[PDB]
Design a protein around this ligand. Structure first.
Ligand SMILES: Cc1cc2nc3c(=O)[nH]c(=O)nc-3n(C[C@H](O)[C@H](O)[C@H](O)COP(=O)(O)O)c2cc1C
Ligand code: SF4
Ligand code: SF4
Ligand code: SF4
Ligand code: SF4
Ligand code: SF4
Ligand code: FES
Ligand code: FES
Ligand SMILES: [Zn+2]
Lengths: 95, 79, 243, 72, 433, 111, 101, 63, 216
């Protein structure tokens, strides 16, 4: 009920090669991506003249000691111009 | 606006050249706006209940807890 | 693709034929004469129970396991209901929810109010069942009913103020134990469970009685008030006294 | 003798058990009572309806007051 | 059709017992005429005949007795079969079966034999009520005379059919009236009911196939099976037919019990056979058509309601046992309902929790409402409790405890609200001083 | 402080609720059935330091056994004291039993 | 190094619920407690006194086994007993004894 | 006086989580059917300074 | 009443049995059921014990009947304490029970109750000493189309002479007359106290089955 606009536009114009999961909840919109393209995806944002995020709020780790990909890195970042925030959440193992 | 803040209009000052002096003046203006809000509340505060309507997310008060039965069950489980 | 509760190796005595029932939608396979409660279990949904134990006989006595089986009238006791091929079981419908709410309302109405001294507080079925399935407010003021406590030897002390008339102990003592001493006597609200000649219980498995009895009335004397359950850790071992 | 010996240390003033035995029974009139003291809140001791059909006093399981039925 | 039943069509020609003893050695006029033919005409014919007649079970349910008898196992088996007669009428206000048993017992006996044959039953137990010592003496005398005459036993009358009937003392309780609880208390254990999924047609008295029928139907069975089912269907109405004996008592000039045909206007019955109410539709306040387990019928409704299994069943109530009660304008209806609820508290044995707890609670609330010590949300709470109990018990005594208060707060809300308001005003006026 | 009834009879009944809700786990409590029959606490101690003063105590108690009296002047010179003893000194909180009582009355209304 | 035991905690013998069965969990069989002489509290010296059954809850025996093997400490998996499911009948409750001998 | 906990506890009365997978076929289909517009790209959340006084609001009093 | 024996002065477990004619009657009663299921006979047998001890039913009697039907005594205890017609409190030589329920209340029963209680010193399930007269209350006993009733149970000569008879169409003066006639005299003819009405029906001319029956 908050930022369907930015999220929808970002998903419908992205290079769909590097998106592994999308969740448009009401708690927070999630782009679960692959750890290989993370920098590419984030550099797409912060630069595109509609979904420019320009501010990174948090980079938190979550630990799940029961899955093959043990860790979970999470980037919470908002768009001060378009009044929206998204959460790009990548997987990550030991080393 | 997470909470009642709509009905509580205020000012939100903004500085023109970001530095120590402008952050300071911002702080004083924020004090004054907070005073505006602190007065707007005790003029609108709607005397009613507080904190819940389900004794499954908020514990029951003392009289009910010590008189009724299921209130004691819920207080026990909730604490 | 739905594993039974806890894992439960069904038998299939005649594996050539076995009925199938719809539990809350998706179907499940069931042996010939299995009850609705075990069918729901196989489907993987627990149903609140007080007076049904997998090792004692059935008795539709607590009246808390109610579900609605479409193609039938309004209420149905899950246990003691032999499954039929194709009946449309349903567990989470407003009918069943309100049935459970009302029954829990009646129990907690004429229950005592001494949880913070009654051990099994933190383990009690009635407690957890109320917190998870029952309402949140009671509407009752008048005086309750209270009975005198009872002694059953130095193993099982009872504060019978909270004997909710389940007959679990009676059915156990008459089926598994072997000695017929406990019995439910009285009528209406004035119904107690107790040997009528203040005798003791000269049999083993009385500790099993105190485990059977869900609400905290029959409790081990030598473990009177030493600890709640949430305080101590359990290690799974074997026995060396017996053989 | 043993419980008060485990917790109390002074053994000069009387232990709680001694005082609650010093208080006499109540000798109520009916068949069922309820123990709180004199207030519903601010004195705790939730409602503890206790029967009185034995020739000996009946304790209250909070603040044992030992109510007793008066007549036959 | 309408009401008014001629003298020749009546069946219980003994309901008062002056020139007509029990033993029928002086009055074998009616019964035991040719039961030999009626039993050698096969059981399937008997079931067909009953289904054709329309004998809606006169116990308080109204099941079509034809189906109820056809439910018994047709093909033979090992374990024998039992019929049990439910002579335990103790619903407050019914005084018919007492007279049947005390004065015309051979009716019940011959009906027991013919129904046992019609059900492929091997034996049959009549469960008398407890405090009927003299009626039980008379019935047992009759049964001994029936055995002595050779009309009930190994070679029943002339048929090879073996049949043993046995009386059983009553206890004193009322829950024993229920089917499964009757079977239980006849076993020997406490009088508590069973669970229905093992219907008492494949797991009954001793685990054998055993059905329970009220004394009404099994006592009417011989004459309906002899005088042809058309003579029976020519009464009452289309789907409700037969002759039933009502026991009208309460606030009439002449408290009575008489037999009429179904679908008879209450006005006609009361004003014709019983004495007219002290004021004919003038000071008559409430009417309870069925037993004490049936919601009320206010004055405006019962002026033109028929008396059958459907008319008042369509209105709100149920005919049940057909023990109509009348209550004048000078009797606190809420007090009468409170007393009924106290009875239900004092009778629910208490196997499963809803009935037990809710019935104690209903009595308490009804007392507080009788004095006037409640509010309006409390009457809505009363309705809610009623609904919960009615829904979710083991068998029909929960509905019994729920129905009268439901009907009360359905058809009598204004006067109850008036009581509450007056108590509140008096309390305020007294507290001001 | 641990209050007690006007009859001199102790209030605490060993529910373990205060110990369970303690966010600092600063309470240790160990009970046993007494000789006369009632249940009471054999050991009850609050190592006052580890007991940050949050308040949950006086809210979890179903009999108002433990309470926080309005005394803040206790500044001993040895850690062991601030490890308030096995209920003994806690019982001596009854030296405030009048003062504490006052507070409770004024909070019976809205609490 | 430490020997660990991988089991599934069985259902509590007091309730009749099921939300806590079938949940593979590793315990470090650490028991080296003693009584603190001052007050009587239970001291300890094992860093793994409680973690194994306070935070480490695994989804399946496979995952817990792989995890123990990964951290290196040697393990010994235990068995999980499951309730056999018979068939019951209220009629079997109301069975019928035979004729007199 | 009308306690009814499910209707009050719309909590735990939430819809289930709905999932879908996509392949190259669906990706191509959506890419083709999709088409932007001169408007409604997103909206913009614009706000600027005003250089307001201090004594204005309510004669500089009310708040 | 209570649900636990308290073993009074001389009724804990004294030896208790039947007489010889009562033994014969016990055989006769036990001869009406399949031998595998004799538990049923618990209901009549219990009653017989009453008529042998003055409406008493002592605990030794429950044990004796439980032994005579081969059942653990707790089942016989259950049977004897669940029903209502069995008393365990040594009521007097004569028991007077008054009915109460709406169709029998609204005819004026409370008057009978109050007057019978005032004429003596008893308190509603109490024993008038010189231990003749116990009085108590019961629920609807059927026949509530006739009148406010009063039932009397007579335990005088034991198994013989015991008689449990009604008394209908009563008024407090008739009741006090009946109770004093029970004390001084022996037996008042039971029935309906000058029935200007016909039993279980109207008064005078019965409005059904007027002249004669006839086999259909
Ligand atoms: C609370 C309650 C009271 C009952 N009272 C009686 C009764 O007085 N007489 C009776 O024959 N059956 C009684 N029953 C049993 C039912 O009326 C049962 O349907 C009946 O015995 C068999 O119906 P039928 O013979 O009319 O077909 C009672 C059942 C319940 C639940
Ligand atoms: S058993 Fe004890 S702790 Fe549980 S709800 Fe019943 S009274 Fe409370
Ligand atoms: S106290 Fe125990 S035996 Fe009694 S009804 Fe409750 S659970 Fe059953
Ligand atoms: S009121 Fe209902 S649940 Fe109770 S004893 Fe009767 S049939 Fe059973
Ligand atoms: S909650 Fe109250 S009485 Fe209960 S254990 Fe704690 S202080 Fe003691
Ligand atoms: S005041 Fe808080 S920190 Fe101290 S023990 Fe009590 S509940 Fe915990
Ligand atoms: S468990 Fe089915 S009724 Fe008690
Ligand atoms: S009401 Fe007294 S006899 Fe039925
Ligand atoms: Zn107390």
């Amino acid at each position: 009920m908050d930022n369907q606009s930015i999220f929808k536009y970002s998903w419908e114009t992205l290079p769909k090669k590097w998106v592994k999961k999308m969740e448009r909840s009401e708690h927070g919109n999630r782009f679960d991506t692959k750890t290989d393209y993370l920098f590419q995806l984030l550099c797409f944002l912060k630069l595109h003249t509609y979904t420019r995020v320009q501010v990174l709020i948090d980079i938190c780790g979550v630990d799940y000691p029961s899955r093959k990909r043990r860790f979970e890195v999470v980037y919470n970042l908002l768009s001060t111009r378009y009044n929206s925030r998204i959460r790009v959440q990548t997987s990550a193992d030991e080393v | 606006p997470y909470d009642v803040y709509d009905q509580l209009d205020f000012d939100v000052p903004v500085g023109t050249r970001g530095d120590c002096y402008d952050r300071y003046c911002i702080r004083i203006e924020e004090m004054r706006q907070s005073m505006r809000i602190i007065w707007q509340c005790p003029n609108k505060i709607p005397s009613g209940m507080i904190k819940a309507d389900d004794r499954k997310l908020c514990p029951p008060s003392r009289c009910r807890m010590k008189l009724s039965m299921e209130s004691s069950i819920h207080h026990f489980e909730l604490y | 693709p739905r594993s039974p509760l806890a894992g439960a190796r069904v038998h299939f005595a005649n594996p050539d034929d076995a009925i199938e029932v719809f539990v809350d939608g998706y179907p499940v396979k069931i042996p010939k004469g299995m009850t609705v409660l075990q069918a729901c279990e196989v489907a993987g949904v627990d149903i609140p129970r007080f007076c049904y134990h997998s090792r004692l006989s059935i008795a539709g006595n607590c009246r808390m396991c109610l579900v609605e089986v479409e193609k039938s009238p309004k209420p149905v006791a899950s246990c003691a209901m032999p499954a039929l091929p194709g009946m449309k079981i349903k567990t989470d419908t407003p009918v069943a929810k309100k049935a459970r709410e009302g029954v829990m309302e009646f129990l907690l109405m004429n229950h005592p109010l001494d949880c913070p001294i009654c051990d099994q507080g933190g383990e009690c079925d009635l407690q957890d069942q109320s917190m998870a399935f029952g309402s949140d407010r009671g509407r009752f003021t008048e005086v309750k009913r209270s009975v005198v406590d009872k002694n059953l030897g130095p193993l099982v002390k009872t504060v019978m103020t909270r004997c909710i008339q389940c007959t679990r102990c009676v059915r156990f003592a008459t089926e598994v134990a072997g000695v017929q001493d406990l019995g439910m006597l009285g009528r209406g609200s004035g119904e107690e469970i107790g040997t009528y000649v203040e005798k003791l219980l000269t049999s083993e498995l009385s500790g099993n009685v105190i485990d059977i009895c869900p609400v905290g009335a029959l409790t081990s004397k030598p473990f009177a008030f030493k600890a709640r359950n949430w305080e101590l850790k359990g290690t799974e071992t074997i026995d060396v006294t017996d053989a | 003798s043993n419980h008060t010996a485990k917790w109390m240390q002074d053994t000069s003033k009387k232990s709680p058990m001694e005082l609650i035995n010093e208080v006499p029974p109540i000798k109520v009139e009916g068949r069922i009572v309820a123990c709180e003291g004199d207030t519903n809140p601010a004195l705790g001791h939730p409602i503890e309806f206790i029967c009185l059909d034995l020739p000996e006093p009946a304790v209250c399981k909070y603040c044992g007051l030992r109510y007793v039925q008066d007549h036959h | 059709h309408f009401g008014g039943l001629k003298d020749e069509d009546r069946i219980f020609t003994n309901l008062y017992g002056l020139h007509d003893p029990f033993l029928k050695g002086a009055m074998k006029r009616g019964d035991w005429y040719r039961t030999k033919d009626l039993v050698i005409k096969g059981t399937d014919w008997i079931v067909n005949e009953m289904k054709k007649s329309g004998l809606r079970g006169r116990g308080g349910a109204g099941f079509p007795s034809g189906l109820k008898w056809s439910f018994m196992p047709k093909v033979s088996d090992g374990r024998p079969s039992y019929l049990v007669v439910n002579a335990d009428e103790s619903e407050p206000g019914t005084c018919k079966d007492r007279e049947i048993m005390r004065h015309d017992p051979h009716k019940l006996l011959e009906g027991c034999l013919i129904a046992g044959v019609g059900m492929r039953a091997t034996a049959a137990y009549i469960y008398i009520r407890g405090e009927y010592v003299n009626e039980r003496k008379n019935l047992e005398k009759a049964r001994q005379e029936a055995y002595a005459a050779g009309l009930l036993g190994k070679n029943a009358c002339g048929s090879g059919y073996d049949f043993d009937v046995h009386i059983h003392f009553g206890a004193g309780a009322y829950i024993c009236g229920e089917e499964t609880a009757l079977l239980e208390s006849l076993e020997g254990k406490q009088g508590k009911p069973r669970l229905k999924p093992p219907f008492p047609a494949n797991a009954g008295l001793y685990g054998c196939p055993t059905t329970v029928t009220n004394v009404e139907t099994v006592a009417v069975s011989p004459t309906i099976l002899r005088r042809g089912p058309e003579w029976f269907a020519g009464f009452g109405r289309k789907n409700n037919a037969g002759t039933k004996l009502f026991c009208v008592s309460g606030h009439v000039n002449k408290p009575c019990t008489v037999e009429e045909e179904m679908s008879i206007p209450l006005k006609e019955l009361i004003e014709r056979h019983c004495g007219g109410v002290r004021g004919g539709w003038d000071n008559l306040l409430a009417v309870i058509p069925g037993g004490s387990s049936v919601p009320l019928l206010p004055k405006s409704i019962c002026d033109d309601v028929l008396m059958d299994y459907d008319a008042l069943k369509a209105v709100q109530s149920g005919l049940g046992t057909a023990a109509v009660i009348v209550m004048d304008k000078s009797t606190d209806v809420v007090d009468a309902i409170a007393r009924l609820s106290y009875f239900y508290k004092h009778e629910s044995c208490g196997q499963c929790t809803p009935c037990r707890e809710g019935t104690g609670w209903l009595w308490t609330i009804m007392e507080r409402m009788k004095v006037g010590n409640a509010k309006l949300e409390e009457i809505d709470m009363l309705q809610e409790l009623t609904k919960q109990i009615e829904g979710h018990t083991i068998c029909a005594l929960g509905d019994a405890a729920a129905w009268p208060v439901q009907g009360l707060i359905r058809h009598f809300r204004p006067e109850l609200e008036r009581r509450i308001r007056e108590n509140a005003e008096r309390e305020l006026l007294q507290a001001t001083g | 402080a641990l209050r007690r009834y006007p009859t001199g009879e102790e209030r605490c009944i060993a529910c373990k609720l205060c110990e369970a809700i303690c966010p600092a786990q600063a309470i240790t409590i160990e009970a046993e059935e007494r000789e006369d029959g009632s249940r009471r606490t054999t050991r009850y101690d609050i190592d006052m330091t580890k007991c940050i003063y949050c308040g949950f105590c006086q809210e979890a108690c179903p009999v108002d056994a433990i309470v926080e009296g309005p005394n803040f002047e206790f500044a001993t010179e040895t850690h062991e004291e601030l490890l308030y003893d096995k209920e003994k000194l806690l019982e001596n909180g009854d030296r405030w039993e009048t003062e504490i009582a006052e507070n409770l009355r004024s909070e019976s209304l809205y609490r | 190094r430490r020997r660990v035991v991988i089991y599934s905690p069985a259902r509590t013998a007091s309730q009749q619920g099921s939300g806590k069965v079938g949940r593979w969990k590793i315990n470090f069989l650490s028991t080296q407690k003693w009584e603190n002489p001052l007050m009587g509290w239970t001291s300890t010296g094992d860093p793994y006194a409680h973690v194994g059954d306070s935070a480490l809850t695994f989804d399946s025996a496979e995952a817990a086994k792989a995890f123990a093997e990964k951290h290196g400490w040697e393990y010994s998996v235990k068995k999980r007993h499951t309730p056999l499911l018979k068939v019951k009948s209220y009629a079997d409750n109301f069975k019928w004894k035979g004729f007199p001998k | 006086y009308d306690i009814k906990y499910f209707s009050r506890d719309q909590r735990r009365n939430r819809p289930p989580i709905r999932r879908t997978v996509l392949k190259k076929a669906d990706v191509e289909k959506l890419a083709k059917e999709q088409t932007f517009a001169v408007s409604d790209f997103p909206p913009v959340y614009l706000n600027s300074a005003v250089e307001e006084d201090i004594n204005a609001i309510g004669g500089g009093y009310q708040g | 009443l209570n649900y636990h024996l308290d073993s009074p002065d001389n009724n804990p477990n004294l030896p208790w049995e039947f007489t010889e004619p009562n033994k014969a009657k016990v055989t006769e009663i036990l001869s009406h059921y399949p031998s595998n299921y004799k538990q049923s006979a618990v209901i009549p047998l219990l009653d017989l014990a009453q008529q042998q001890h003055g409406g008493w039913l002592p605990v030794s009697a429950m044990n004796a009947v439980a032994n005579i039907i081969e059942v653990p005594p707790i089942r016989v205890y259950e049977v004897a304490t669940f029903y209502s017609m069995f008393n365990r409190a040594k009521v007097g030589k004569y028991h007077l029970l008054v009915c109460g329920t709406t169709p029998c209340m609204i005819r004026g029963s409370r008057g009978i109750e109050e007057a019978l209680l005032k004429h003596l010193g008893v308190k509603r399930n109490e024993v008038t000493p010189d231990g003749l007269f116990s009085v108590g209350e019961m629920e609807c006993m059927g026949c509530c189309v006739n009148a406010p009733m009063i039932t009397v149970a007579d335990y005088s000569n034991g198994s013989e002479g015991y008689t449990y008879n009604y008394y209908e169409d009563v008024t407090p003066e008739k009741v006090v007359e009946i109770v004093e006639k029970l004390r001084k005299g022996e037996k008042p003819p039971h029935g309906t106290q000058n029935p200007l009405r016909i039993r279980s029906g109207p008064e005078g001319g019965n409005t059904t089955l007027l002249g004669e029956p006839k086999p259909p």
